[PDB]
Amino acid sequence: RFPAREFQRDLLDWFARERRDLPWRKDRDPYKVWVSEVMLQQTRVETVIPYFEQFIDRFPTLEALADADEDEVLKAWEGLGYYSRVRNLHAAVKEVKTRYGGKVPDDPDEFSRLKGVGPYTVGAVLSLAYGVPEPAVDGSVMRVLSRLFLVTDDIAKPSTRKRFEQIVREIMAYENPGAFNEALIELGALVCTPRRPSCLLCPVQAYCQAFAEGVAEELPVKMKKTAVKQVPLAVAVLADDEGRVLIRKRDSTGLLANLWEFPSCETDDGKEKLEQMVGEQVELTEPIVSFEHAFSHLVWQLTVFPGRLVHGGPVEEPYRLAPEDELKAYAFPVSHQRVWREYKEWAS
DNA sequence: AAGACGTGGAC
DNA sequence: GTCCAGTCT
Ligand code: SF4
Ligand code: NA
Numbered sequence: 629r630f631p632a633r634e635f636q637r638d639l640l641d642w643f644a645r646e647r648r649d650l651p652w653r654k655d656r657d658p659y660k661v662w663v664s665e666v667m668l669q670q671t672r673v674e675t676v677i678p679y680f681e682q683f684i685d686r687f688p689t690l691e692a693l694a695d696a697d698e699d700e701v702l703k704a705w706e707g708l709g710y711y712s713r714v715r716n717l718h719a720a721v722k723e724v725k726t727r728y729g730g731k732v733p734d735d736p737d738e739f740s741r742l743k744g745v746g747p748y749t750v751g752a753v754l755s756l757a758y759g760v761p762e763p764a765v766d767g768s769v770m771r772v773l774s775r776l777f778l779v780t781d782d783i784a785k786p787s788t789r790k791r792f793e794q795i796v797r798e799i800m801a802y803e804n805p806g807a808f809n810e811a812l813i814e815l816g817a818l819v820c821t822p823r824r825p826s827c828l829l830c831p832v833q834a835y836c837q838a839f840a841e842g843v844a845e846e847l848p849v850k851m852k853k854t855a856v857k858q859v860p861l862a863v864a865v866l867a868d869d870e871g872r873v874l875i876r877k878r879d880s881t882g883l884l885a886n887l888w889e890f891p892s893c894e895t896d897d898g899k900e901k902l903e904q905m906v907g908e909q910v911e912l913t914e915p916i917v918s919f920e921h922a923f924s925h926l927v928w929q930l931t932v933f934p935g936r937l938v939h940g941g942p943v944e945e946p947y948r949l950a951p952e953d954e955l956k957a958y959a960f961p962v963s964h965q966r967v968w969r970e971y972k973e974w975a976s
Numbered sequence: 977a978a979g980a981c982g983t984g985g986a987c
Numbered sequence: 988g989t990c991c992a993g994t995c996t
Contacts (some may be wrong), residue, residue: 670981670982670983671982671983671984672983672984672985674984674985675983675984675985707982707983708982708983709981709982709983709984710981710982710983711981711982712980712981713981713982784977784978785977785978786977822986823986823987854978854979882980882981883980883981883982884981884982885981921982921983922982922983922984923980923981923982923983924980924981924982924983925979925980925981926980926981961982961983962982962983962984963982
């Protein structure tokens with residue numbers, strides 16, 4: 629019982645007028661669409677634009693990305709967040725090069741088989757680049773649809789998303805699915821804002837149940853996030869006579885996977901506990917700073933300890949000896965990028 | 977299902 | 988402080 633064409637025409641017409649000239653919107657190349665869509669996951673547009681430009685300059689084609697070293701891609705993603713995204717993407721393009729020859733699959737099931745690609749990305753990439761009419765329901769669309777159709781379901785349950793996707797199937801403009809999908813996302817970004825929605829400027833105010841009932845400001849429905857754990861972290865900054873610095877690569881599974889870091893222990897006696905780990909030859913000074921750094925699911929409480937490094941053997945993996953002049957090359961998390969900043973300030 | 981998984985911007 | 992900008996497991 630939806631005036632689908634009336635809603636479609638107003639939304640699609642409004643999108644052509646208000647469409648932002650974003651970098652990934654210069655064309656409909658799947659690789660560039662695929663890169664932008666992954667980057668945009670849980671990340672604001674304004675944050676992504678520069679990463680996308682540097683990334684695409686370093687990796688202009690799917691084959692360039694697949695052919696690149698794992699550490700080269702991680703550096704390009706340095707500071708963007710959720711780094712498993714890029715590791716999954718780097719693997720996914722490698723599969724596309726070998727399995728599909730470098731042509732991004734146009735089949736939803738085939739593309740959804742690739743790593744890091746879920747329901748939104750299949751809809752987004754395939755609807756825009758190839759025209760496949762698969763729904764592209766992100767958090768923004770779920771808010772838009774929860775207001776257009778007054779849905780109280782918790783948008784957290786995967787099932788609630790499934791309903792919205794089925795809604796998109798029926799209201800979609802199968803005529804131009806790609807333009808229909810990105811119109812919802814652009815509407816969610818520009819008009820149906822998370823707070824203080826501008827429903828008077830909305831091209832689809834008439835077709836919106838929530839605005840009629842006056843409760844758009846009270847949607848979407850979502851459970852309050854669980855409180856995060858607090859994790860004390862002791863961090864060692866170690867220098868030898870020649871100014872080289874001890875850094876180590878984190879394991880490829882779990883938190884900040886394959887990122888380089890200054891050696892640390894989750895000391896829940898920091899200086900002693902740091903000094904025990906290293907033995908498996910150096911001594912530490914008193915702390916110089918303590919600062920916090922937030923994750924989605926926990927908070928690090930860091931404390932930086934300067935120290936001197938005496939070489940009694942080869943610096944074996946995962947550790948590596950890095951001159952100060954070479955640290956700029958490795959990819960560090962923002963947390964340990966701040967460890968270094970505070971360390972050099974203290975040196976001054 | 978719900979926790980793991982980064983970082984930054986706007987309230 | 989809160990909320991927001993998906994996929995794997
Ligand atoms: S009328 Fe208001 S609630 Fe409805 S889609 Fe537009 S901005 Fe969102
Ligand atoms: Na997948």
